[PDB]
Amino acid sequence: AVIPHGKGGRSSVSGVVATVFGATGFLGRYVVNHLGRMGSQVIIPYRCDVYDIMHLRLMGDLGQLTFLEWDARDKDSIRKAVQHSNVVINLIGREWETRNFDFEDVFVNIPRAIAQASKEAGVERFIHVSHLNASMKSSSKSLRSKAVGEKEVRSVFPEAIIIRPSDIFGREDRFLNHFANYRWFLAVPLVSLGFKTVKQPVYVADVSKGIVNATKDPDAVGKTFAFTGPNRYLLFHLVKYIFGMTHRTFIPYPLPLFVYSWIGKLFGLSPFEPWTTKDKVERIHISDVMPTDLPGLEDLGVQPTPLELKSIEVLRRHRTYRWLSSEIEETKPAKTVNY
Amino acid sequence: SRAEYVVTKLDDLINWARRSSLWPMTFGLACCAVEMMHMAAPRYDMDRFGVVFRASPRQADVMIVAGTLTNKMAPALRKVYDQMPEPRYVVSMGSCANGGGYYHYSYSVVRGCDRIVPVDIYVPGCPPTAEALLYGILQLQRKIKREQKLKIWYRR
Amino acid sequence: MFFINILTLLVPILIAMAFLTLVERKILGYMQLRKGPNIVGPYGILQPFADAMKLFMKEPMRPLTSMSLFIIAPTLSLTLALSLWVPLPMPHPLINLNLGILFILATSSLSVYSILWSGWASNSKYSLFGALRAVAQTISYEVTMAIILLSVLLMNGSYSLQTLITTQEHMWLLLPAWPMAMMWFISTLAETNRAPFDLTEGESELVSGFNVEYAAGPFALFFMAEYTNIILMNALTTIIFLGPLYYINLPELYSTNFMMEALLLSSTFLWIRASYPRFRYDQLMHLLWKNFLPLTLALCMWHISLPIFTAGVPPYM
Amino acid sequence: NMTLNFGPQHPAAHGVLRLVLELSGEMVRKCDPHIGLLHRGTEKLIEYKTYLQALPYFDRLDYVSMMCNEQAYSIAVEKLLNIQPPPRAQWIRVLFGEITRILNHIMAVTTHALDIGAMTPFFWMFEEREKMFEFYERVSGARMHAAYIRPGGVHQDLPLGLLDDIYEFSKNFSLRIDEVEEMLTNNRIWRNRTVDIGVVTAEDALNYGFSGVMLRGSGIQWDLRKTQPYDVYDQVEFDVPIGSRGDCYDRYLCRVEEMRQSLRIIEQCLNKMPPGEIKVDDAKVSPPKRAEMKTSMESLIHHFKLYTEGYQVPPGATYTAIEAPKGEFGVYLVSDGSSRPYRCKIKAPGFAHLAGLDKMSKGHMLADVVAIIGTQDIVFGEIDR
Amino acid sequence: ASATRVIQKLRNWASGQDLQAKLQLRYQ
Amino acid sequence: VKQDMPPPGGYGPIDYKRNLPRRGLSGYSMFAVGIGALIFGYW
Amino acid sequence: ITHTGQVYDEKDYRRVRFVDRQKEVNENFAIDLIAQQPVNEVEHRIIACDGGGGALGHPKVYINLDKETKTGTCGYCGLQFKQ
Amino acid sequence: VRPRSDVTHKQLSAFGEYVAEILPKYVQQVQVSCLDELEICIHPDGVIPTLTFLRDHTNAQFKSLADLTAVDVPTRQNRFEIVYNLLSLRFNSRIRVKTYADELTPIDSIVSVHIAANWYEREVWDMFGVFFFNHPDLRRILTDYGFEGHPFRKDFPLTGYVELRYDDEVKRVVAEPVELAQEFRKFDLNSPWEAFPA
Amino acid sequence: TYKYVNKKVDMKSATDNAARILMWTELIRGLGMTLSYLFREPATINYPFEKGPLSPRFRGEHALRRYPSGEERCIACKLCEAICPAQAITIEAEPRADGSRRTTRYDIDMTKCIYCGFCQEACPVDAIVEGPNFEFSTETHEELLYNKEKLLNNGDKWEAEIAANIQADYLYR
Numbered sequence A: 001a002v003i004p005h006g007k008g009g010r011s012s013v014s015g016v017v018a019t020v021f022g023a024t025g026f027l028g029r030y031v032v033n034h035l036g037r038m039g040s041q042v043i044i045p046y047r048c049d050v051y052d053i054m055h056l057r058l059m060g061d062l063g064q065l066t067f068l069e070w071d072a073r074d075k076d077s078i079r080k081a082v083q084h085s086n087v088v089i090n091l092i093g094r095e096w097e098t099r100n101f102d103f104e105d106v107f108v109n110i111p112r113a114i115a116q117a118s119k120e121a122g123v124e125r126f127i128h129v130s131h132l133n134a135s136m137k138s139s140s141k142s143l144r145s146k147a148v149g150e151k152e153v154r155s156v157f158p159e160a161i162i163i164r165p166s167d168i169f170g171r172e173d174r175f176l177n178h179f180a181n182y183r184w185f186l187a188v189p190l191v192s193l194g195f196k197t198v199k200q201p202v203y204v205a206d207v208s209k210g211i212v213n214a215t216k217d218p219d220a221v222g223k224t225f226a227f228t229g230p231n232r233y234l235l236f237h238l239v240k241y242i243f244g245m246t247h248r249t250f251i252p253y254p255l256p257l258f259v260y261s262w263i264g265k266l267f268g269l270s271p272f273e274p275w276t277t278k279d280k281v282e283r284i285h286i287s288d289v290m291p292t293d294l295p296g297l298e299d300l301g302v303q304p305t306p307l308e309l310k311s312i313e314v315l316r317r318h319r320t321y322r323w324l325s326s327e328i329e330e331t332k333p334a335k336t337v338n339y
Numbered sequence B: 001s002r003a004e005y006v007v008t009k010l011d012d013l014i015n016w017a018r019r020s021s022l023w024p025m026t027f028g029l030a031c032c033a034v035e036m037m038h039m040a041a042p043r044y045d046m047d048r049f050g051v052v053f054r055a056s057p058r059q060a061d062v063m064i065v066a067g068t069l070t071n072k073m074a075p076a077l078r079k080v081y082d083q084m085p086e087p088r089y090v091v092s093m094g095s096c097a098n099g100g101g102y103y104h105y106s107y108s109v110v111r112g113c114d115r116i117v118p119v120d121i122y123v124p125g126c127p128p129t130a131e132a133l134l135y136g137i138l139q140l141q142r143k144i145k146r147e148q149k150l151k152i153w154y155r156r
Numbered sequence C: 001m002f003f004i005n006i007l008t009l010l011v012p013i014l015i016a017m018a019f020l021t022l023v024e025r026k027i028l029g030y031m032q033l034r035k036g037p038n039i040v041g042p043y044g045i046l047q048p049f050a051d052a053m054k055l056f057m058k059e060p061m062r063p064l065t066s067m068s069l070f071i072i073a074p075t076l077s078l079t080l081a082l083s084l085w086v087p088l089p090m091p092h093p094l095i096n097l098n099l100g101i102l103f104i105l106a107t108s109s110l111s112v113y114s115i116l117w118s119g120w121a122s123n124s125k126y127s128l129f130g131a132l133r134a135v136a137q138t139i140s141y142e143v144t145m146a147i148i149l150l151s152v153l154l155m156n157g158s159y160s161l162q163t164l165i166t167t168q169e170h171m172w173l174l175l176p177a178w179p180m181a182m183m184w185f186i187s188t189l190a191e192t193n194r195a196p197f198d199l200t201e202g203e204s205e206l207v208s209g210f211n212v213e214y215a216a217g218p219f220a221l222f223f224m225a226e227y228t229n230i231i232l233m234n235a236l237t238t239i240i241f242l243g244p245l246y247y248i249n250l251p252e253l254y255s256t257n258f259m260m261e262a263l264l265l266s267s268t269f270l271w272i273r274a275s276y277p278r279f280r281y282d283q284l285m286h287l288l289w290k291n292f293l294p295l296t297l298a299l300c301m302w303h304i305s306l307p308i309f310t311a312g313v314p315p316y317m
Numbered sequence D: 001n002m003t004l005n006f007g008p009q010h011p012a013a014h015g016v017l018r019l020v021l022e023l024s025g026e027m028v029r030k031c032d033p034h035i036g037l038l039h040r041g042t043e044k045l046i047e048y049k050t051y052l053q054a055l056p057y058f059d060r061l062d063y064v065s066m067m068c069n070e071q072a073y074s075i076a077v078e079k080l081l082n083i084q085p086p087p088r089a090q091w092i093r094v095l096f097g098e099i100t101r102i103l104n105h106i107m108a109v110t111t112h113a114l115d116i117g118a119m120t121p122f123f124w125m126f127e128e129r130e131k132m133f134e135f136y137e138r139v140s141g142a143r144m145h146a147a148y149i150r151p152g153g154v155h156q157d158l159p160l161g162l163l164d165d166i167y168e169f170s171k172n173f174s175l176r177i178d179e180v181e182e183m184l185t186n187n188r189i190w191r192n193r194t195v196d197i198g199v200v201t202a203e204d205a206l207n208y209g210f211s212g213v214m215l216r217g218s219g220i221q222w223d224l225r226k227t228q229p230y231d232v233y234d235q236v237e238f239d240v241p242i243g244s245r246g247d248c249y250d251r252y253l254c255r256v257e258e259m260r261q262s263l264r265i266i267e268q269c270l271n272k273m274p275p276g277e278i279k280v281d282d283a284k285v286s287p288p289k290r291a292e293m294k295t296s297m298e299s300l301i302h303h304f305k306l307y308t309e310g311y312q313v314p315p316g317a318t319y320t321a322i323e324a325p326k327g328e329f330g331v332y333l334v335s336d337g338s339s340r341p342y343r344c345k346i347k348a349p350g351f352a353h354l355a356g357l358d359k360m361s362k363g364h365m366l367a368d369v370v371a372i373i374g375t376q377d378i379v380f381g382e383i384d385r
Numbered sequence E: 001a002s003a004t005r006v007i008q009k010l011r012n013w014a015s016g017q018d019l020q021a022k023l024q025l026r027y028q
Numbered sequence F: 001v002k003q004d005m006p007p008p009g010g011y012g013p014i015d016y017k018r019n020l021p022r023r024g025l026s027g028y029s030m031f032a033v034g035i036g037a038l039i040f041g042y043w
Numbered sequence G: 001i002t003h004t005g006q007v008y009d010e011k012d013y014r015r016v017r018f019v020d021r022q023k024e025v026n027e028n029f030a031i032d033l034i035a036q037q038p039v040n041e042v043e044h045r046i047i048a049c050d051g052g053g054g055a056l057g058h059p060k061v062y063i064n065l066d067k068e069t070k071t072g073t074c075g076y077c078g079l080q081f082k083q
Numbered sequence H: 001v002r003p004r005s006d007v008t009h010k011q012l013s014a015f016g017e018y019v020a021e022i023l024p025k026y027v028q029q030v031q032v033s034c035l036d037e038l039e040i041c042i043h044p045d046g047v048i049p050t051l052t053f054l055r056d057h058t059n060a061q062f063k064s065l066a067d068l069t070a071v072d073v074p075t076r077q078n079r080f081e082i083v084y085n086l087l088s089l090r091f092n093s094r095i096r097v098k099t100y101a102d103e104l105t106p107i108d109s110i111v112s113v114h115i116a117a118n119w120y121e122r123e124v125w126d127m128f129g130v131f132f133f134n135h136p137d138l139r140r141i142l143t144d145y146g147f148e149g150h151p152f153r154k155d156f157p158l159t160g161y162v163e164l165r166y167d168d169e170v171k172r173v174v175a176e177p178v179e180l181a182q183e184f185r186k187f188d189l190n191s192p193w194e195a196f197p198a
Numbered sequence I: 001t002y003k004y005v006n007k008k009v010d011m012k013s014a015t016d017n018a019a020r021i022l023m024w025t026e027l028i029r030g031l032g033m034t035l036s037y038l039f040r041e042p043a044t045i046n047y048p049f050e051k052g053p054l055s056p057r058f059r060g061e062h063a064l065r066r067y068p069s070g071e072e073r074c075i076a077c078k079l080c081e082a083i084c085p086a087q088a089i090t091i092e093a094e095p096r097a098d099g100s101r102r103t104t105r106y107d108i109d110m111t112k113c114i115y116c117g118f119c120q121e122a123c124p125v126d127a128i129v130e131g132p133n134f135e136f137s138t139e140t141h142e143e144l145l146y147n148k149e150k151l152l153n154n155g156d157k158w159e160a161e162i163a164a165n166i167q168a169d170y171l172y173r
């Protein structure tokens, strides 16, 4: 262990050595941020080129962040990453199963090997991440697979904290940006005209702090917290609201999910990171599960943050020359449908 | 024909083009420009090596942060950095910008530019010798040569 | 065939256009006691291709700018430059536009749109000023540029650039009309925004207003345009005022001679750049609405009377 | 009145200057220079450092003029101790004092042109600069930021052979100054952008505390080196280059003329430098020679105390000003009896000059502002300190 | 140096003074 | 032990004055050659 | 490992650093090098120790090799002198 | 031993009385230091009057302001010691006029007497906090735009209380309380043995 | 002694003036100067193949020397730490079992260091020296921080040249 000394800011010590495998991505950028702010030792395994990993270097004190070369199809790489970590956080995920990695791998296969080694290592806690509403019988191969894995991860690292977050919105978010990015398509194809699609969005930061807090909190063991949000929404208001802040017209157009799954297939066909995918589409039109009983963000200390509050920052880049100067409070916030 | 080979060769070409022409940016802050200007000057011609010292964040790649990054200039550096084209590399020059230098404990000096911009090559020395900068620019060229962006795309 | 004759007359110029930047980054070098770029490739021959590839690969930043106009201006620029090379009267010119000089004058004027629109589209204060400054100087230098040609034509008899090869079979039009050559050369320096007259992208004074926000591929296209122009205008000096030798039996001599004179006058604006500081905006325009325009108007009269009182009216063929 | 920040990163603006400007048309209605983009604390840091460990700060205050600045602190610390350097050291300081003036003027004249748009003069004279740096290196060890001129003389005698090379160079440098003139002094275009731009009256120049070429250019005759001689600048003979019709062009001509006059002072120093020691013999102020500290007890004790604790200057305060290449560089060094100073306000020829930018660039175009920042040789290190 | 006696004369004529006497190449 | 000092007898003399040469074709002569060129060209 | 045996340990949270990058340690440790140095025999009761080379050595000290019981060791070179 | 020229020590002393008689009202102490420098000391109210007499008197023309500075003696009730160093190009001489100002007792501004002071007075406010009445535009010059505290005050920590880093979460530079990775080692240097004053 | 830098209508005078104004003579004069240099040998050096000359006092990169026997020179008097202007050198020491005095940790923070060369000056045994190498640019900030093992290793690598350099300049010091 590492006795925590310091005042609490950078150049201080908190004693959390933590491998975080998917740091390179959207949420990782946030997980490493807090871990680095707190002063934790962070080992970030990477297979992206060094130029891309640079944004990470700026976050954390001299010697807090260590970057290791790692390949998923090689068990040895995971072995050495967790050698000296005491906390392992797993954020490995993708939406387009790629040529050499299918949803099982990114969600269930890999995230298992990882926690498996972590135990061999003797890491105190493991925090796997799987999607919220990842029912073992959900429509999207992704959600199905993610559930399959959570079953497995429990075997390897029993009680490794698991967090199932709801749609995640933050600068560079898919949930929020993607819709705003449908502008190219003059009209907006939405099943049930964007209704029959209740969803609860969660700011990237909210999810993170929770994850970090999970590592430094005792109660988290053997829990399945589900970071959800501060307000639910029928997909209709969400879509329009977005277009609202973006200040771009909205033409919600009904299109059968049947035919639309096909549109996802089309983009999915594209070689370079399909803009959209069969699965993503299903996931989009997949409603979010109820509050149930699972604990939440505030349970882990971070009170959720309403979408409208920070939406302005996420959707600003999509505005025009003048629309770029409008602010959220003169704008009309959309209604909340709990259903 | 194995695409893998086809890929490596292609990447190399891409790396050769970038490494060969590294238009640096105008960033003198603390009298290390004087050294840099010496590099640009005739004994140690930067141009021969491809460097052309463009003066617009937009069309410049390498940002040689020569000098002390005071607190007031910190945000600006970040801005200019953010406004450069995508593939951007930063070469910190000077003990005053690698770390804090003679002015590390001051209240108005950021202790290093790598706290405000990610830094790729750190060139040491209070007036880092112009040859040393040239060595540092040449090591950035070896750093780029090794980068393998398309092979990771292919293997991803 | 005609297509092949379009590759030649284009590619060859584009490849030469690339080698001008190199001969600029070395001639400026040796003048300033430095080798210039010799390490990439042999003697720097691969240097122009190298940054072209870097420029195209780097992200084409789209500032948060009127997209259509922002992207069109570069296109217009290159389009015009490459187009202006179509009717040039090197022997057996690609296209005998009967009123070629007018065509050259016309397309040359259209270029101004690019800089103007670019600045307006860029939406940056530096760019705006650059455009305003640029349009003014550009158009003004067009006014003396055009009158200087009208004086020439009246001693050539026609607007077709092909006629001057027959006008200059005994003496260059520099001997006569040298006073305008100089004034054509200085105006050619202004219209290609080269050094003595480069307030469009002064860099030091204002930072490259024309392409403040332009980077990567857009930067390159104008870029290419400027340098091709640098050649074209020099080439027009090498047909209108310095008339290369020509022999119907051997049409090549003309091209070869045309080459030598074009390269030397292209070398001259490279040499001018390193040698002179840059004129101020006000100073620049004064020179043309004040120092030159009165000179150019008067000689026009002299060149109107010359033929008559010398009964030297030219054939209209 | 359009507002515009000249911008910290301006290819022309030396270093980093945010010159917020309100421009009526292209004319500059108002010029409010912003400073402190390079404030670093040099004045507060010195209070926490001993006299000898604060000497390196002075080289960094205005580093174009690396040494001349060091001489000002030296002189100041010598006055407070009432010690004066040995005869050879004095000549050295004048030798490298002048070499440094050339270095500054080559910087000021050639960098002025680069902003104007003439780029070949910079490369021509930066090669000569380079050759000079090498003198610094072979005397101090560092190309710039030497730390050679210390409070009690210079640190180490000149290498055995430097004088000869500071001759070969001097013997030729003239032609190099001559070449530049050809291009600019009479360029049909240099004159225009420089002549009648930023004229400063004589009374106004004294009033705004210009104190430099800027005063001399307006015709006021004041060279602190002739009026109040420091070191052995009294034993040499040089002509101050006074100017009339003070404007950017006239002052320039003055800076080219002091480059010329400094070669006259350098020649003499080479012709008449005395045999002797280069540091005071008071182990009390100057550190003992290394052979002595390794064989004599009193020398080790004096070496140990000097390096670890310090000079222990007697309590007092002094303002000593020299004629740094930019203008009057002065250190007001208040000192308690302690080994570390109490205050050290550095008067920067440059804090006063920038202030004048407003009263100089009035009803002027954007390009005029670029020319005037050049004619003040603003090094933001001295202004920001 | 290595003027060859013709590049030197173009150099002297263009400059208007003798650079040979005050060269840019320092030698022993 | 030796100290770098000026050579015995002192160093030689340096130039501290501009040696810019006022060399040019006289103006009348200059104009005449030019006007003569135009006259021949016109003929 | 090193001179004073720095051993970031199997359980330390810092040994993480060397992963994929070697540690800086020294062969020919000095601790044993002077021990490998022969005892400089002398005739005089007291002896000097310039460190060897005068100015290029250590401040000269005079060691009292007066008792064969102990070989004087100049505090600077660690050289034992055998009376 | 420095080459003192008594010729000076006397002439400057004589001027010091001259000024003391000419302005009995504001001059509190006048002394020509052994370093051959005069340092008239004036009541803060005499800032305008004493300077003006020196700028515009035939027998004492002190046209340019070399510097305006403020030492801070925390012990002294009036913390700051504004010091104005002036030059006379006519008589080739100098004099320093120094006044005392407390933190919240402002001094008059001399921008009228010398416009050189427009900037230095802003510098003294930014670093030490003395305020100058009738100043055209007093505003921080050297410190950051949002800086809180006057830095050169002896009671201000060298490292200060705030430092800047870029935070990704907020994608903007952000102050944080200073956390230093090697504190300034405060070597104690004063020796417990004094030097018998000559 | 002062000098006036710029203190200062016959047909010939006027005509010559016009000749200059309309024939741009003073401009042609400037072109001649640059054409002249174009013919001069350029002064640049192949940087990797040929190196700009540095004489013995060049400060360059820090190294800790050792006695020929093999005993590291430093005896931890710690005044190199005292006179370091930037607070760069951190030294903590304890008596080695031999009983001698040695530094357990000697850390020069090169990013903090401003290469003044006073440490070279201050050391009594001259254990810390300014080594000739200036090319030690590093990819990561941590590499620039140097502990005793890197400096001792730096000392062993460059000892031969360091000894030659100190040999050349010690009489001067």
Ligand SMILES: CCCCCCCCCCCCCCCCCC(=O)OC[C@H](COP(=O)(O)OCCN)OC(=O)CCCCCCCCCCCCCCCCC
Residues within 6 Å of the ligand: C174, C179, C180, C181, C182, C183, C184, C185, C186, C196, C237, C241, C272, C276, C287, C291, C292, C295, C299, C302, D188, F034, F038, I021, I022, I023, I024, I027, I028
């Ligand atoms: C009798 C029958 C009718 C014929 C009569 C003929 C009478 C004799 C000829 C008289 C006119 C000859 C000269 C014509 C061109 C010059 C016109 C002129 O007046 O120059 C304007 C300007 C100089 O003006 P300025 O110095 O500011 O002072 C103005 C005073 N009124 O000029 C400039 O400032 C130019 C600045 C140029 C900057 C770049 C210089 C480059 C120099 C090298 C290239 C020179 C041109 C080479 C041409 C090659 C061939 C095309």
Ligand SMILES: NC(=O)C1=CN([C@@H]2O[C@H](COP(=O)(O)OP(=O)(O)OC[C@H]3O[C@@H](n4cnc5c(N)ncnc54)[C@H](OP(=O)(O)O)[C@@H]3O)[C@@H](O)[C@H]2O)C=CC1
Residues within 6 Å of the ligand: A021, A022, A023, A024, A025, A026, A027, A028, A047, A048, A072, A090, A091, A092, A093, A094, A095, A101, A106, A129, A130, A131, A132, A164, A165, A166, A167, A168, A169, A174, A175
């Ligand atoms: N915001 C969202 O959309 C939601 C996300 N989640 C979960 O949170 C986690 C993080 O989300 P987010 O950051 O947006 O996901 P990203 O798509 O940004 O990827 C997350 C990380 O996983 C890594 N990764 C992906 N595929 C592979 C692979 N085949 N091999 C190795 N590494 C891989 C990526 O690195 P690299 O790109 O370099 O391979 C990246 O660093 C995901 O695993 C996801 O399941 C849950 C609910 C909502």
Ligand SMILES: COC1=C(OC)C(=O)C(CC=C(C)C)=C(C)C1=O
Residues within 6 Å of the ligand: B025, B026, B027, B028, B033, B036, B037, B040, B053, B054, B055, B056, C203, C204, D011, D114, D115, D119
């Ligand atoms: C020609 O104008 C200039 C620039 O614009 C291209 C610069 O970027 C720079 C900055 C480049 C370096 C190498 C400091 C300078 C000095 C300059 O004079």
Ligand code: SF4
Residues within 6 Å of the ligand: B030, B031, B032, B066, B067, B068, B093, B094, B095, B096, B097, B101, B102, B125, B126, B127, B128, D060, I114
């Ligand atoms: S490092 Fe030395 S040289 Fe570079 S800026 Fe800081 S001080 Fe000036």
Ligand code: SF4
Residues within 6 Å of the ligand: I073, I074, I075, I076, I077, I078, I079, I080, I081, I091, I122, I123, I124, I125, I126, I127, I128
């Ligand atoms: S001074 Fe020389 S000996 Fe004393 S500690 Fe520093 S290095 Fe070791």
Ligand code: SF4
Residues within 6 Å of the ligand: I083, I084, I085, I086, I087, I088, I089, I108, I112, I113, I114, I115, I116, I117, I118, I119, I120
């Ligand atoms: S060089 Fe100057 S700064 Fe660097 S360590 Fe030695 S003393 Fe401290």
Ligand SMILES: [Zn+2]
Residues within 6 Å of the ligand: G049, G050, G051, G058, G074, G075, G076, G077, G078, G079
């Ligand atoms: Zn010994």
